[PDB]
Amino acid sequence: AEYRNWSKPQCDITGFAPFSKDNSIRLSAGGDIWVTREPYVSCDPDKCYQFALGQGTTLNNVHSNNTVRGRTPYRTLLMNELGVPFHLGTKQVCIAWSSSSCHDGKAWLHVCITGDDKNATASFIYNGRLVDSVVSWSKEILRTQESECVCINGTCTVVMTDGSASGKADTKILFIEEGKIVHTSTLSGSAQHVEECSCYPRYPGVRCVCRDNWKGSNRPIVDINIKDHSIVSSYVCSGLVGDTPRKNDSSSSSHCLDPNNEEGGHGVKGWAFDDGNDVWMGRTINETSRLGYETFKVIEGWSNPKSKLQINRQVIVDRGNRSGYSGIFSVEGKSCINRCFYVELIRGRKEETEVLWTSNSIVVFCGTSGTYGTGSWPDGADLNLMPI
Amino acid sequence: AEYRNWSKPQCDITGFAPFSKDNSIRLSAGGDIWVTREPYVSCDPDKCYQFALGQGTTLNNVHSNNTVRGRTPYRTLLMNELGVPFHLGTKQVCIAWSSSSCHDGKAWLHVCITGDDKNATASFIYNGRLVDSVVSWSKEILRTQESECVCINGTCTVVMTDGSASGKADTKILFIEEGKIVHTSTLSGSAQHVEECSCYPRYPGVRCVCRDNWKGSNRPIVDINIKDHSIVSSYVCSGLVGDTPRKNDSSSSSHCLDPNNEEGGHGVKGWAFDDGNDVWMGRTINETSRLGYETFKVIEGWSNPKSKLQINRQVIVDRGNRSGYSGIFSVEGKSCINRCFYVELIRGRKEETEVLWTSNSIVVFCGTSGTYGTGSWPDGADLNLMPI
Amino acid sequence: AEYRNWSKPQCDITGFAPFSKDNSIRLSAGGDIWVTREPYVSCDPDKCYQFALGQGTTLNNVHSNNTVRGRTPYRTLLMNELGVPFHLGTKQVCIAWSSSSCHDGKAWLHVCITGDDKNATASFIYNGRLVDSVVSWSKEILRTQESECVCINGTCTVVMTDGSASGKADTKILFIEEGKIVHTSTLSGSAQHVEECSCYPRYPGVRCVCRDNWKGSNRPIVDINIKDHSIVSSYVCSGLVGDTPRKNDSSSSSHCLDPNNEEGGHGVKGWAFDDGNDVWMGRTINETSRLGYETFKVIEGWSNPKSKLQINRQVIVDRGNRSGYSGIFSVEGKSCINRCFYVELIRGRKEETEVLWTSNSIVVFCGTSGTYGTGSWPDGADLNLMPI
Amino acid sequence: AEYRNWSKPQCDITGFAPFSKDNSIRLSAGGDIWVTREPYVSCDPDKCYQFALGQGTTLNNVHSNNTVRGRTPYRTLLMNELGVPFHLGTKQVCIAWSSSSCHDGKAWLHVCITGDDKNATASFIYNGRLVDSVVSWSKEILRTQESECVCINGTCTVVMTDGSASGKADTKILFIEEGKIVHTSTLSGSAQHVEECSCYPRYPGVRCVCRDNWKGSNRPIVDINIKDHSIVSSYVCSGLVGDTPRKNDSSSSSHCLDPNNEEGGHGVKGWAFDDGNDVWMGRTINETSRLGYETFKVIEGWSNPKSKLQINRQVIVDRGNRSGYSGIFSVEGKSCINRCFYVELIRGRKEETEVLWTSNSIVVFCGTSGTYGTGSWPDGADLNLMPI
Numbered sequence A, B, C, D: 001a002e003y004r005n006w007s008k009p010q011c012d013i014t015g016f017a018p019f020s021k022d023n024s025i026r027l028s029a030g031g032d033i034w035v036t037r038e039p040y041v042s043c044d045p046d047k048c049y050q051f052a053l054g055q056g057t058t059l060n061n062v063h064s065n066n067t068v069r070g071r072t073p074y075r076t077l078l079m080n081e082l083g084v085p086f087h088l089g090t091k092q093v094c095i096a097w098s099s100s101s102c103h104d105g106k107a108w109l110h111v112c113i114t115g116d117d118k119n120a121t122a123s124f125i126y127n128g129r130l131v132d133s134v135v136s137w138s139k140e141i142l143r144t145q146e147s148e149c150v151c152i153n154g155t156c157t158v159v160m161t162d163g164s165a166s167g168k169a170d171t172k173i174l175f176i177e178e179g180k181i182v183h184t185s186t187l188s189g190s191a192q193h194v195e196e197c198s199c200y201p202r203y204p205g206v207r208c209v210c211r212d213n214w215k216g217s218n219r220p221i222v223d224i225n226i227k228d229h230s231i232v233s234s235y236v237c238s239g240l241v242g243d244t245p246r247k248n249d250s251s252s253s254s255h256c257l258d259p260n261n262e263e264g265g266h267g268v269k270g271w272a273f274d275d276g277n278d279v280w281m282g283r284t285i286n287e288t289s290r291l292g293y294e295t296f297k298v299i300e301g302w303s304n305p306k307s308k309l310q311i312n313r314q315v316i317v318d319r320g321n322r323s324g325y326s327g328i329f330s331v332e333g334k335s336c337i338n339r340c341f342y343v344e345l346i347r348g349r350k351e352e353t354e355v356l357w358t359s360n361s362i363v364v365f366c367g368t369s370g371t372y373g374t375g376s377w378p379d380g381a382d383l384n385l386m387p388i
């Protein structure tokens, strides 16, 4: 049982093939399911696990009312094997209203954040025990990735941000070894605002496509060297921009170094990855609202901020159906590292007033070298008929 | 952990002994059980699993209305250990409205089909990761076995069909190594229409008894050659024929190479297997609708299309109770390979109107060289008393 | 892994200490619990498992009505780890309205009987596969232990009976190796009528204490030589008798060789085992119906039919609460073989009319060489308050 | 598989970081959850489990009325992995209205106590089998820790008590090897009343901080030597006292050798451990009720009975929210033994009269050598809306 090095070439990708769906909300209309948001997927060397931030309630439960609030003391990080819905026998791995997790090849690491808005604690749990913890540094809603962290040769990296959701905030990259924070680097380079990174192994370092909640509707890239703890940052060149909200396809623009100052305020967790000078990326179909989800390859979109040339569009979720967050994760094949992605399908408040609650289901696709068709895999539930 | 070969002779069979019963519908009247159809059974070297395509819903649930619909974005392949009903902690192992699984002696392969009717994706998931995928090739419902695939020396074979359900169609046989498609042989031989193949190992090959939905109420046999990827095909010779609908024993006839053209349109998944020049097989008792289930040996049924000589009839489900699909699976003993079979006990729509859902339960019987008696093991739910 | 020889002396036993209690019925007034009966405990070399025969329904279910019927085609053998109640997650191992199970030290064998009254089938399932089966031999309810079998050097043995519940019947002892019936020895010796043996290892052989449903309220003993397959049989000498119904303490008598001819009709499954020339035994407290449960030692109970000298009484279930079936199982310590017993606590029909169903819970005790006190541990459910 | 000896230094401790929350009551508002009390956490070498005392019922369940009663024949010890809440799949591991548990590195010991008030039995269950038992020695509610025991080089140790709750009483220290009571020392030294010890491994021996139900608001300390079986005892010097009820922080006083005689009668289980001459300790925030919960360090709190200088306070549960029992457990790190604690959050009767039941949820913190913020993590259930 050795540490993961991720030192294989990236797999060829022609687009994505369906992988998993949990049907969470449809199951809750007739069963006991955890209320959740901020879901994500991560895998040990054998199998993939699904993760979410619980609201310390099930759905057909009085405590469901007001689960739109995203920081309560009852939020726990749930962990099942992938495709096992979050039923009552699901294990709550830590107290977290914000988190991240990764397996280094030997054990699970879990970065968990709970407490008061202005004085939060982040806990680091490795191989089933608490190993370290750190205070909020800027005393303003300390938060992390909401998707998998990445470990290389024993060292795990995680990007955390404390500070304003709409001005310069303070972002750090922690390097954890077996639960212990061994080094902390601060954000450097040109990305002006970073949130909810979707990171992946790009041997010999780590790459992150994040969220800019301030001036940018293009996406910040962050590049972590694991050996000397140096950090560079920039933006996803691509003329077609990953964030929501944003400008429409014709109107939009980007920039390889700065935020585009286009609709920038607010955002969503999303992902992207290089393919030579091309970029594979997903996004909500609608530019303003979290409806629908699509993916495509942008030719020259990693190095040309003028490129708007998309090939291989797939609809994952049709524009009439709600979506949400999304993030990457990497699965090691025999010869190559695959990239896969999960999409959050949010139902309930405040967009939908049919119910009093707010939760999600997920859907998961993995890259493929093979061939694929079409279809739309949305959440499914009829809220007109749900509990109360 | 070595690759399975099934390089053992087929065990003596004097009939079938009772093996397993999930009591799924009766349980779901006072419990939370998945709605499902197209159930099946495959075993790793240790123990047996039950599979079904779920309907992304439980039974006592608003979402269970109209579950008669065969293909939806919400259908997932379920997998419990055999005997474990489909409760909420059941793993969904992939997105699928048609599927097939098998174990190569090292890990599970799952062949999963989901998507648009005219543009469907088949994802190939091996050892808990996605290895390959293919588009629909003839853009008319890409479909597969709905029972176990078969692996020999870590080369797994699966039969897939795309095209009309009542005319010539495009059948291919795939050869999957560690989740990777290494070859696609197209169907050759004298079989005119092939669906839902119940395959089993027959060292050094694989043999399938399928469903002809077009002209034949006999059953196609497809012989796969694992080493040089060649394919021959024909029909099961026996005069008492496998399909439903069909005509009574007095009027029915067969042919070793062609569809019988006797009430051949429409069908049902079923199974058969050779014993020297004799045939073991099961089928519905009612000739036209899927009521009852029975199993027998036809003497010279494997080779002599005039033979109508059955010895060893067992009622499995009596004539007055609903059955459905049924398939073979194989189990390796100390000395030899046993053959077993399950039976889908379909309840609900469109045949029964007391309820709005369509679901199933199952019963499994296994080969025995010992003795046995009689009995009938139906589903046994009272639908008059179920969820409004 | 190695086969169990049980080649260690019986532990010193001063009485019994509390071990396990499942609270089945009480939990079912607010949970989804299986309707069961004919429970029992058996242990693999690490931990113990509980078994019962389910009714194809949960308690809060419409199908729970009339579960006083012992033989339905919906009855499956359930297997959970000891002290895990029979929830919807529970595995059904085989179809059975009668069973026996044991672990040879490498795998589980289960002996499962289902089918028609006049033509039942016994299945022999070993290491998760069906390996043999036998037909009812006298066409009158083929039935077996309803508790653990015993395996010595990988040769397991089990006692089955076919024929009258109130007359001579045909009892046979099967020797099973790796699921395969290698021998069948018919009952021999002075035992006149024999049902539901509570068997235990007693190196170099096995011993059973059974239920005479015909002409004895004393209990049959059967001995089984594992190497030569010979069978001797008699009765539990003790003038204090173990079956129920029976005559009261002052009136009763016994015979080392013959049924006592005392209220001898009917019976109840129960157990005894020898400690030198003394006899440890449990029985219902009330002589004529299945109320309460007690245990004691009879001085000279094993070699004196006129002995009525009890020491070491413990009340397991008090005379106002319902008991039922009860059986032995054995557990290997470092230096000795402990003997333990379970007690079925039945509730519902026919004796209790406040509910429509018939189910049970269990309490379990284990032999102790230490000291102990006193208590009553009944079912504890409130029928006047159960699902109406 | 070697035995644990804990021969490693106590980790640097700056205070506590959040580890786990179970959210149990909130879930039983829409889920089938066990009624519990007296919970606690212990860990094997890999991972942590959570135990609590069931009431032989779930919450939404008519049997939950009256569960303020602490000793019933339906009380069983529960054992899930930590953060997996007590759903219907939870293993009851023994009969017990009082218990302790610990893993010695190879297997689990459970010390389980049930039976009559005046004649309790304590069963000792190791590696999945019953190895011993004792009767109550003074015939007045025999009782043990309700938290982990401690094992060293294969010798485990537990503190037990029999006798008056409000006068002198009979406390013993049992030493257990592989489930066998190998020695019994009786309580010695300054401590006058010893209940519910929270014990930890302080190489080469064991240390416990207990509850004095009689004359003390300061907390008994009991040193256990594991090699020569010697017992000394005293009280927690610190002038800030650990028990509830107590006098306030201005009025209170302690004493290193004797109870303090201050509002002393009654109590609550709690914990403390030494840090050189300082004392880390927790306690309720309210002096006379089990409202709130706080932890702090007292400088010179382990030697100076005049010292009232607290540093590093944390609020675990705010003053207006309920708590209850709280105890310690210890976790072996790479280099050091860490100390963690759990806090029982009791809800319901007789304090809260909106509901008929009495149950609890739980929070768990672990020692950290890093930094932390603040917060509060109460039960958070809404009894005004709960069941009936």
Ligand SMILES: *[C@@H]1O[C@H](CO)[C@@H](O[C@@H]2O[C@H](CO)[C@@H](O[C@@H]3O[C@H](CO[C@H]4O[C@H](CO)[C@@H](O)[C@H](O)[C@@H]4O)[C@@H](O)[C@H](O[C@H]4O[C@H](CO)[C@@H](O)[C@H](O)[C@@H]4O)[C@@H]3O)[C@H](O)[C@H]2NC(C)=O)[C@H](O)[C@H]1NC(C)=O
Binding pocket: A015, A249, A296, A310, A311, A312, A313, A314, A372, A373, A374, B118, B119
């Ligand atoms: C079965 O499923 C497959 C795979 O999902 C479908 O094939 C895909 O079709 C999509 C969408 O039409 C393709 O993505 C598109 O690529 C265009 C490229 O245009 C041409 O140029 C290349 C040369 O580089 C030629 O090889 C090729 O023949 C193309 O004609 C882009 O320009 C498209 O972007 C524009 O259209 C989308 C969608 O309408 C807009 O939203 C965008 O904003 C933009 O204006 C688009 O990305 C994809 O590449 C195909 N995949 C594969 C693997 O071939 C089948 O069409 C489908 N069959 C059926 C019946 O549904």
Ligand SMILES: *[C@@H]1O[C@H](CO)[C@@H](O[C@@H]2O[C@H](CO)[C@@H](O[C@@H]3O[C@H](CO[C@H]4O[C@H](CO)[C@@H](O)[C@H](O)[C@@H]4O)[C@@H](O)[C@H](O[C@H]4O[C@H](CO)[C@@H](O)[C@H](O)[C@@H]4O)[C@@H]3O)[C@H](O)[C@H]2NC(C)=O)[C@H](O)[C@H]1NC(C)=O
Binding pocket: B249, B296, B310, B311, B312, B313, B314, B372, B373, B374, C118, C119
């Ligand atoms: C207890 O359980 C056993 C085993 O399950 C039952 O015995 C089986 O009974 C079935 C049904 O009768 C037997 O199967 C039948 O075989 C017939 C063979 O014909 C003859 O030839 C052989 C020698 O070559 C003789 O041994 C035999 O006596 C016959 O004279 C077929 O003719 C039957 O098919 C026809 O009957 C059925 C209706 O039963 C129709 O629906 C068919 O369409 C067809 O016309 C049938 O296949 C089977 O062989 C027996 N198995 C064994 C191992 O003996 C017992 O009957 C049962 N006991 C009780 C009391 O129920």
Ligand SMILES: *[C@@H]1O[C@H](CO)[C@@H](O[C@@H]2O[C@H](CO)[C@@H](O[C@@H]3O[C@H](CO[C@H]4O[C@H](CO)[C@@H](O)[C@H](O)[C@@H]4O)[C@@H](O)[C@H](O[C@H]4O[C@H](CO)[C@@H](O)[C@H](O)[C@@H]4O)[C@@H]3O)[C@H](O)[C@H]2NC(C)=O)[C@H](O)[C@H]1NC(C)=O
Binding pocket: C015, C249, C296, C310, C311, C312, C313, C314, C372, C373, C374, D118, D119
């Ligand atoms: C705390 O817990 C312990 C252990 O459970 C109890 O001690 C047991 O008590 C029982 C019942 O009282 C004892 O079992 C009885 O033994 C009797 C033997 O009688 C005496 O005579 C012989 C020979 O002269 C002496 O050798 C021996 O020392 C005895 O003093 C039997 O006569 C009893 O059977 C008769 O009475 C019962 C009711 O008790 C009837 O129902 C029977 O049918 C019959 O008439 C019985 O077998 C047992 O031996 C004790 N166990 C141990 C290990 O010592 C404590 O009493 C209990 N304490 C409290 C306060 O409850």
Ligand SMILES: *[C@@H]1O[C@H](CO)[C@@H](O[C@@H]2O[C@H](CO)[C@@H](O[C@@H]3O[C@H](CO[C@H]4O[C@H](CO)[C@@H](O)[C@H](O)[C@@H]4O)[C@@H](O)[C@H](O[C@H]4O[C@H](CO)[C@@H](O)[C@H](O)[C@@H]4O)[C@@H]3O)[C@H](O)[C@H]2NC(C)=O)[C@H](O)[C@H]1NC(C)=O
Binding pocket: A118, A119, D249, D296, D310, D311, D312, D313, D314, D372, D373, D374
């Ligand atoms: C974010 O979270 C951190 C960590 O939880 C908080 O820092 C802790 O704050 C608490 C509360 O004030 C501190 O606990 C207190 O320690 C005092 C020690 O006094 C001094 O100690 C030395 C030398 O004198 C100096 O370093 C320091 O400046 C202190 O002034 C005790 O005196 C306190 O006890 C009294 O307070 C409580 C009520 O608050 C009473 O009920 C007590 O009985 C008693 O009268 C108290 O114990 C704690 O030490 C801090 N820990 C650390 C590691 O710094 C931050 O406060 C928080 N930040 C924000 C903005 O909320």
Ligand SMILES: *[C@@H]1O[C@H](CO[C@@H]2O[C@@H](C)[C@@H](O)[C@@H](O)[C@@H]2O)[C@@H](O[C@@H]2O[C@H](CO)[C@@H](O)[C@H](O)[C@H]2NC(C)=O)[C@H](O)[C@H]1NC(C)=O
Binding pocket: B065, B066, B356
């Ligand atoms: C059960 O559903 C039927 C049919 O519903 C169809 O399938 C659903 C999943 C969804 O796609 C619906 O829009 C479809 O109608 C319901 O009966 C239909 O109701 C519609 C609108 O109310 C009406 O126009 C038609 O009469 C019905 N459609 C068909 C095809 O028959 C019905 O409401 C449900 N029954 C109950 C008792 O709830």
Ligand SMILES: CC(=O)N[C@H]1[C@H]([C@H](O)[C@H](O)CO)O[C@@](OC[C@H]2O[C@@H](O)[C@H](O)[C@@H](O)[C@H]2O)(C(=O)O)C[C@@H]1O
Binding pocket: C038, C068, C070, C071, C097, C098, C141, C142, C143, C144, C164, C165, C195, C196, C213, C267, C268
């Ligand atoms: C295999 C089987 O059915 N066993 C029964 C058992 C046997 O019938 C008994 O050993 C005689 O052979 O009887 C049990 O019967 C209970 C139930 O059955 C009616 O037939 C009876 O007349 C009623 O009074 C009623 O109690 C038993 O527990 O004694 C159950 C067991 O399943």
Ligand SMILES: CC(=O)N[C@H]1[C@H]([C@H](O)[C@H](O)CO)O[C@@](OC[C@H]2O[C@@H](O)[C@H](O)[C@@H](O)[C@H]2O)(C(=O)O)C[C@@H]1O
Binding pocket: D038, D070, D071, D097, D098, D141, D142, D143, D164, D165, D195, D196, D213, D267, D268
């Ligand atoms: C073994 C047992 O019953 N332990 C109790 C414990 C003991 O009574 C204590 O150690 C003193 O010997 O007390 C606890 O009980 C609280 C409960 O007690 C009733 O008798 C009384 O009516 C009320 O005070 C009621 O709250 C305790 O929490 O202190 C719990 C534990 O189960």
Ligand SMILES: CC(=O)N[C@H]1[C@H]([C@H](O)[C@H](O)CO)O[C@@](O)(C(=O)O)C[C@@H]1O
Binding pocket: A038, A070, A071, A097, A098, A141, A142, A143, A144, A164, A165, A195, A196, A213, A267, A268
């Ligand atoms: C830790 C945390 O609170 N995360 C929350 C984010 C952050 O506020 C943004 O990252 C702003 O920085 O906003 C959400 O409403 C959202 O967009 O879905 C909910 C999510 O739970």
Ligand SMILES: CC(=O)N[C@H]1[C@H]([C@H](O)[C@H](O)CO)O[C@@](O)(C(=O)O)C[C@@H]1O
Binding pocket: B038, B070, B071, B097, B098, B141, B142, B143, B144, B164, B165, B195, B196, B213, B267, B268
């Ligand atoms: C892939 C798919 O949809 N299969 C469906 C089949 C096909 O229509 C037949 O193979 C004819 O092509 O028909 C069913 O109604 C049936 O017969 O039970 C259900 C099943 O789900």
Ligand SMILES: *[C@@H]1O[C@H](CO)[C@@H](O)[C@H](O)[C@H]1NC(C)=O
Binding pocket: A248, A250, A251
């Ligand atoms: C997009 O941009 C602007 C909205 O600011 C609008 O005027 C224009 O019509 C839109 N173009 C398209 C192609 O939708």
Ligand SMILES: *[C@@H]1O[C@H](CO)[C@@H](O)[C@H](O)[C@H]1NC(C)=O
Binding pocket: A285, A286, A287, A288, A289, A319
């Ligand atoms: C986004 O939603 C609005 C409706 O609120 C719609 O007008 C707009 O065109 C949508 N964008 C797309 C691409 O459909």
Ligand SMILES: *[C@@H]1O[C@H](CO)[C@@H](O)[C@H](O)[C@H]1NC(C)=O
Binding pocket: B005, B007, B153
């Ligand atoms: C399986 O394939 C290998 C090739 O690597 C071959 O050498 C081996 O003998 C094959 N198995 C059998 C039974 O022929």
Ligand SMILES: *[C@@H]1O[C@H](CO)[C@@H](O)[C@H](O)[C@H]1NC(C)=O
Binding pocket: C248, C250, C251
């Ligand atoms: C035993 O039962 C008989 C009734 O048949 C009765 O004569 C006798 O009194 C009973 N003995 C006792 C001790 O109750």
Ligand SMILES: *[C@@H]1O[C@H](CO)[C@@H](O)[C@H](O)[C@H]1NC(C)=O
Binding pocket: C286, C287, C288, C289, C291, C319
């Ligand atoms: C035996 O059981 C019946 C049940 O109704 C009861 O009436 C009778 O009194 C009991 N006998 C004894 C001796 O307890």
Ligand SMILES: *[C@@H]1O[C@H](CO)[C@@H](O)[C@H](O)[C@H]1NC(C)=O
Binding pocket: D248, D250, D251
């Ligand atoms: C604490 O309460 C007691 C009541 O006996 C009293 O001595 C003291 O004044 C109180 N302390 C404070 C600070 O009010």
Ligand SMILES: *[C@@H]1O[C@H](CO)[C@@H](O)[C@H](O)[C@H]1NC(C)=O
Binding pocket: D286, D287, D288, D289, D291, D319
């Ligand atoms: C303790 O709890 C009681 C009950 O509500 C409350 O009245 C009292 O004020 C509390 N004491 C303190 C010191 O907060």
